[PDB]
Design an enzyme around this catalytic site. Structure first.
Site, PDB file in Angstrom:
ATOM      1  N   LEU A  67       0.923  -1.208   0.439  1.00  0.00           N
ATOM      2  CA  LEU A  67      -0.188  -0.128  -0.205  1.00  0.00           C
ATOM      3  C   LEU A  67       1.061   1.077   0.419  1.00  0.00           C
ATOM      4  O   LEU A  67       1.739   0.989   1.369  1.00  0.00           O
ATOM      5  CB  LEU A  67      -0.901   0.445   0.933  1.00  0.00           C
ATOM      6  N   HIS A  68       0.535   2.228  -1.142  1.00  0.00           N
ATOM      7  CA  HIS A  68       1.707   3.310  -1.485  1.00  0.00           C
ATOM      8  C   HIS A  68       1.086   4.455  -0.999  1.00  0.00           C
ATOM      9  O   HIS A  68       2.163   5.093   0.251  1.00  0.00           O
ATOM     10  CB  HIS A  68       1.737   3.567  -3.084  1.00  0.00           C
ATOM     11  N   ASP A  69       0.492   5.285  -1.547  1.00  0.00           N
ATOM     12  CA  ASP A  69       0.137   6.369  -1.571  1.00  0.00           C
ATOM     13  C   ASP A  69       0.171   7.208   0.231  1.00  0.00           C
ATOM     14  O   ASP A  69       0.520   7.734   0.568  1.00  0.00           O
ATOM     15  CB  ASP A  69      -1.198   6.974  -2.421  1.00  0.00           C
TER      16      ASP A  69
END
Ligand SMILES: [Ca+2]
Ligand SMILES: [Ca+2]
Ligand SMILES: [Ca+2]
Ligand SMILES: [Ca+2]
Ligand SMILES: [Mg+2]
Ligand SMILES: [Mg+2]
Ligand SMILES: [Mg+2]
Ligand SMILES: [Mg+2]
Ligand code: NI
Ligand code: NI
Lengths: 346, 346, 344, 344
Positions: free
Chosen positions: D260-262
C-alpha cells in the site's frame, strides 16, 4: 616538391574524380587508397576505387584497402544493387573489371586473394607513414570517416601527427540528405566527433558551402572536350557521363541548373590551399539530435558577436569559399589531369 | 471583411512594427495582445507592447496580457537591463511611460492593478473567442510559443479550432542565434513541438527564408519619410531609429548591408496571403539535439525525391518566399500604416 | 574441455577469474586480452601477466593488450601519475622481476611488448572462430570495447561467437552509478553493438548474482584449510586481494562480507547447471544522462502478457544461482586455489 | 493541525490516502486536485469525489480537475472506450447517485462540472500559499504535472511550498519500468522542474518504503476487528480495494502480500518522526530512452567523499521507516477506517 598522402573515400562519381586528380597530380604522392561504407557497401566502394585506378592505368601502382563496413555505433545506409547495375552508373565497367590487375595491397599484406582483406589492413601502413613524417601525414577524406576514427582508436598517439583534409559538412548553408547536415558527417557523426576531439589537425576544405559553387557548366564541358577529345574521345564521353549522371536529380530535387562536383575540391586544397579562405573555430558535431545528427555547429557567429566570451578551444579549420580565380584554378587543374589521362588511355 | 485575431509577441523592435500593422490595418480586428519571455523578461515585453500601443494612441483600446516568464522545460535566456536602459532602445520612452493609460485587461479580469496580472489570464478570453469562431480563430505569434503551448495544455479540445500564423524558424537557409535554428523556436522548442502535434492549423508564414529578404533599404526609408514627415517628423525619426537600431550588428555579425524586418511579415500573411508561396509538409522540431534544438526539420526533400514513400502526415504549412510584387505589397502596406499613425500622432 | 578466450581488466576480481579459468581442467584458455577500466589498458595488461606468473602460466598463455578507451566516450582510467597499480594490497616486485617473455610476441612476430597494438588479438580470435564446430566461447569481465571492435572488423563472425559475461544489474540497483554496473556504463555502446550483432550473449554474472557471492569468514577459513599447508605466503596474498575493498564495500554499500564478481562468469562456462536462465530482449541505455549502461529488459512484460511481446530475444540473463550453486562455486574456487598453492 | 492540499490520481492507493488525510485530525485538507494517470483526469476527478462521498465529506471538500496530460509527453491513460473505471472491484452506483454538489463550483462561480478547467485550483492554492506563515504543504501521490503547471504560472510561490510525495525508487528497482516508478516516469519533466524551482521537496514514500508496507492477513484481521462491528459492508469494500491487484503483485512482482503506497506520504506529514531522512541532490532522468523518470542521487558520493560534493542538495529522501514505524502507520490507518466505518 610533392606531398605524400593517403585517400579515404567511398566512390562514388565524385570520389572517382578526386582519385583521378590526386593520382595524376604531380604535387600529390598517393601512398594508398582506403575505402569506406556509404550509400553502397564497402565492398562496392573498394571495387569502384579499383575501377577508377584501372581506367587511368594505375591499378597496378596504388594499393587499395577495403575498410569498415558500417559506422561505429549506427546502422549502415548502404543499399543493394537491385539487379546487376554497375554501382558507378553511366558507364559499362565490364572490360575494366575483367582486365583488372592484382591489387598491390595483397603483396604488402602477404595475402593470396581479396577475400583475405580485412577492415584494419591499412593500419600498419598508415602507422609507418605517420611515424616517418617529419611534421604530420596528410589524409584526404571524402566519405564517412569511420576508417580514420577506427585507426585513432587503435593508434591514439598518432592523432597529433595526422592532418586531415576533407569533403564534409555544411556551415552557412543547409544540408543535402538531411535538412541541416551533409551525408559524410551524418552517416557516422560519432566518427568525426571522435576525430575532432583526438588532436587531429582537421580542415573542412570542401563543405557544401564551397562544393555547391563548383558547377559543371556547359562552359566546363566544352573545356573538358577541348582537352580530351583530341587524345581519347571515348574517355571524353565517360567523364561527361559520370559528371552528369545525377544532373536530373540535382535539378529536380535541389534546383541546380548545372550539377556540383564535390570531392576533388578536397584534393585541390592539398595541392593549392592559397585559393581557399580559411577560418578557425570550435566545431561541435551533433550526435544526440534525432533529426539533426551530423550537423556541424560552430562558434563562428559568437566570435563575431563577442570575441572575449569564447570558451571552447578551436578544433578545426573551415573553408567557407574559394577566393577570386579559385574556381578557374580548380577547373584548370582538373581539366589538365583529364587531358593527361586521355593521352594515356588513347 | 475583417478578421478577428490575437497577437502573441515579445516586443522587441520587430514585434512593435507587427503590432502597428495589425492594429492599424482595417483587415485585422485585434482582440488582445499577450506577451511572452524572450531575450527580455515577460514583464519587459508586456511594458514594450503597452509602449507600442500608447505611441499609436491605442493603449486605452487593446487589452494586453502578461504571459509566461520561462519555457515549459528549459531556462529563460532573458537578460537584465544593465543600468536603466529602456529595453526598446533607440527611443526615450519616459513620456510614453508616464502618460500610459490603464490597461483594459484589468477591467476584463476584475483586477485593481497590474501586480495581479498572472500568466494564464488570457486563457478565458481566448476560449471565448475560439468558442465563438465559425471555423477557426486566428493567432499571430512572433515570439516564443510558450503561451500557446500552455493554453493548449489547459484547453486541448480547442487545438482543432485554432489557426496559428507565425514568425518562426528557418528551412532552406541557416539560423541566426544558433547555427541551424531560429530564436523563436530554439527558446522553447518543446512548445512548438507540442503545438504541431496538438491539431493546430499551423503556418510558418515568416521564417528567416522570407524575412532575410525583407530589408530596410534607403529606398524604403525615403518612402517612409514621404508618407510620415508631412504629418509627424517626430514619428518619422522614431520609426527609422527603431528600424535601424540593430543595423550595425546585422552588418558586422550577419553581413547584411541593409537590416531585415521580421515579425510584421506574419501579420501581412493574415492580411494578404496571396503574396506568399505555400507548401505543406511534416515539420519535426528538434528537442533532443545538444547544439541543434529548435531546428525545423521537414520532409520537403523526401517529397521531391520519392512522393509515395512519405510516411509522416503533414502537420504544417511553410512559406518559403514572397511572390513577385510581394515585397512591394508588404512595404506599401507598412508605409500606409505608418502614414496613418503619423497623422494620428501629429 | 572447452576452448575459450578471456577478456578482462584485472582488477582483483579478474585475477580470481583468470586463476579459475586457467587452472580449471574444463576450460582450455587460448589467450587473454585486456581492456581499459579504472586503470589504463597497459596496467591491466601487466596485471594479467602478473596473475599468470604468480600461478606459473605466464610462459604458456599469450596475453594481448587491447583498446585504451571506449568506442565513443572518454576513459574513466586514473592518470598514471596517480601511481595506482590496479592490483593493490600486494608487492609485485618479485613477480615482475621473474616475468617470462609473453608468448603473444612470437605469435605476432614482435621483438618486445612496446610493439603490442589493440587489434593484435583479432587474427588469433578469427582463427579460433573459424575452427570452432559450433561457436567459440569468450568470457568477458571488463568493458566490452575489445569485442565490439572485433565485431566491427569481423561482422560475419558474430554468429559463431558465444559470450559469457560479468556485467549489468537487472532486479537490483547499480554500483558505480545508481542503476547501472561498471562494465556496462564504461562503454554502453559496445554492449549495445554486441547485442545487435548476432552474438549469443549471456549475462551470467550480473550484480543480482555476484552480490550473493560473498567472502565470509567461513570462506576464508576454507581458503586457509586448502592453501596454508602448501603455501602460507599465497594464502596471505589471496586473502589480502579478496579483502582489499572490504572497508569500502562495508562503509559505502553496507556489505558485512565483500562480494566476488568476475570468477562467477567463468564458473558459468564450467558448470551452467547451477544457474537459472531466462531469455529476453535487453536494451542498453546509451542516451540517458545519468542512466547510461542500464540494462532494461522486457521480462516483466513477458510475465504480464506473453503474446504482446514485440522485440525478439537477444540475450540470456542469469538472475540467480540454484540451490547448492553457491556451495559448488566456492568448492570450485577453493580447489583451484589449493592447486595453485601446491604449485606456487 | 496542518493546512494542506492533496494532489492525486485515485487510484486505489490514493483513495486510502484521501481517507487518511481527511479523517486524520492532524491534517486540515483545503482541497483535492486530480491529475492524469492510467486513466483520464476526468475519471480520477470522479474517483476522488466517490472517495469523499463514501466517507461523507463530498459536501465539505472542494475537488478540482487538473491537467489531462504531461508537460511535453503523451498521456498513458487508457481510452475511455476501454470502459475501465480506475477504482475497480466495487459497485459505485449508489455513491454516484447520492453524490452532492462539488463545493469547488461555488468557489469558482460555475454552474456545473462541465465548466471545470485544469488551472481552476491555481487561485485557491495561491491564496493558501500567500497566507501561510512559513510554507504551505502539498501531498502529491500521482503525476506532478499539476504542481509543475502551477509553478510555471506562479514561480515566486516555489519558495513557500513544501511537497511531500509518493514517488520514485532509489536503492531498489522500479515497477512499471525497470528502474523508474510510475509517478515520476509519467511526467519526469514536471518533477525535474519542481526540484529546480525552489520547492522544499521530500520523497516521503518511494518504493523503497512502500514495498515494505504490506497488507498481510494480520493487517486484514486488524481491519476487520476495527470495521466489521460498525459497517460490514465497508469492511468488504476496503478489503476488495486493497486486494484488487493482489494477483498481479504476486504473479508479476513476487509479492505474497500486496503493498500500500500513497497513504504513507500523508502519514509523513502527520508523523515524520517514524521516517529516516537524508538530504541529497536528485537528478531526474529526462533524456533516457528506457530510463526516463529514474531518480539518480549523489548519496553514494556523499558517503564516499563528503568534501568532493559539487551539486547543492535539492531534496529530502526517506529510504526507510524507523523501528515501530510500520506498526504506527497501520495503527493510524486502522483508526481512520474504524471512524469511517462508524460514520458510513
Ligand atoms: Ca564521396
Ligand atoms: Ca519577436
Ligand atoms: Ca573486471
Ligand atoms: Ca496514486
Ligand atoms: Mg599524384
Ligand atoms: Mg486592425
Ligand atoms: Mg584451464
Ligand atoms: Mg483531516
Ligand atoms: Ni586515481
Ligand atoms: Ni485499458
Amino acid at each position: 616538391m610533392s606531398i605524400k598522402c593517403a585517400l579515404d573515400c567511398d566512390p562514388g562519381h565524385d570520389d572517382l574524380a578526386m582519385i583521378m586528380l590526386a593520382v595524376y597530380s604531380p604535387k600529390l604522392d598517393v601512398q594508398y587508397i582506403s575505402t569506406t561504407h556509404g550509400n553502397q557497401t564497402v565492398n562496392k566502394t573498394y571495387q569502384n576505387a579499383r575501377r577508377t585506378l584501372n581506367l587511368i592505368k594505375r591499378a597496378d601502382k596504388i594499393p587499395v584497402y577495403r575498410g569498415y563496413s558500417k559506422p561505429l555505433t549506427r546502422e549502415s545506409v548502404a543499399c543493394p544493387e537491385i539487379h546487376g547495375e554497375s554501382g558507378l552508373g553511366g558507364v559499362d565497367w565490364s572490360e575494366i573489371d575483367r582486365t583488372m590487375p592484382r591489387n598491390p595491397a595483397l603483396d604488402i599484406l602477404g595475402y593470396k586473394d581479396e577475400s583475405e582483406l580485412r577492415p584494419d589492413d591499412f593500419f600498419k601502413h598508415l602507422h609507418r607513414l605517420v611515424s616517418a613524417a617529419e611534421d604530420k601525414f596528410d589524409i584526404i577524406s571524402t566519405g564517412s570517416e569511420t576508417n580514420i576514427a577506427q585507426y585513432l582508436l587503435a593508434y591514439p598517439e598518432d592523432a597529433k601527427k595526422i592532418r586531415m583534409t576533407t569533403m564534409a559538412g555544411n556551415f552557412m548553408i543547409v544540408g543535402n540528405i538531411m535538412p541541416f547536415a551533409e551525408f559524410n558527417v551524418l552517416i557516422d557523426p560519432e566518427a568525426i566527433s571522435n576525430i575532432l576531439q583526438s588532436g587531429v589537425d582537421y580542415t573542412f576544405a570542401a563543405p557544401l558551402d564551397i562544393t555547391h559553387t563548383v558547377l559543371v557548366t556547359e562552359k566546363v564541358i566544352n573545356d573538358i572536350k577541348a582537352a580530351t577529345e583530341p587524345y581519347s574521345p571515348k574517355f571524353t564521353e565517360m567523364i561527361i557521363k559520370l559528371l552528369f549522371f545525377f544532373k536530373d536529380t540535382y535539378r529536380d530535387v535541389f534546383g541546380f541548373i548545372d550539377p556540383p562536383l564535390h570531392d576533388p575540391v578536397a584534393a585541390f586544397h592539398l595541392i593549392a590551399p592559397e585559393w581557399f579562405e580559411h577560418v578557425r573555430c570550435h566545431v561541435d558535431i551533433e550526435t544526440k539530435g534525432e533529426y539533426t545528427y551530423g550537423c556541424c555547429c560552430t562558434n563562428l557567429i559568437l566570435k563575431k558577436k563577442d570575441p572575449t566570451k569564447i570558451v571552447k578551444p578551436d578544433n578545426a579549420t573551415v573553408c567557407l569559399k574559394l577566393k577570386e580565380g579559385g574556381h578557374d584554378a580548380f577547373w584548370n587543374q582538373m581539366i589538365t589531369v583529364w587531358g593527361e589521362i586521355a593521352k594515356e588511355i588513347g
